[PDB]
């Protein structure tokens, strides 16, 4: 199974549809396109 394994740090871009991490706004906004679907706000807000 999965396992949300990570190294020393954490990004300050992440998704939550496919939960990656990015180095730039610019990819994970572009990356966004992708999904291309709707989904609520979900748990751990912060
Ligand atoms: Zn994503």
Same mark, same amino acid.
């Given at each position: ?39 609520? /706000?979900?748990?751990? /807000?912060?």
């Amino acid at each position: 199974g999965s396992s949300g394994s990570s190294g020393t740090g954490e990004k300050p871009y992440e998704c939550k549809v496919c939960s990656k991490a990015f180095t730039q706004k610019a990819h994970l906004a572009q990356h966004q396109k992708t999904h291309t679907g709707e989904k609520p /706000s979900g748990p751990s /807000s912060g």
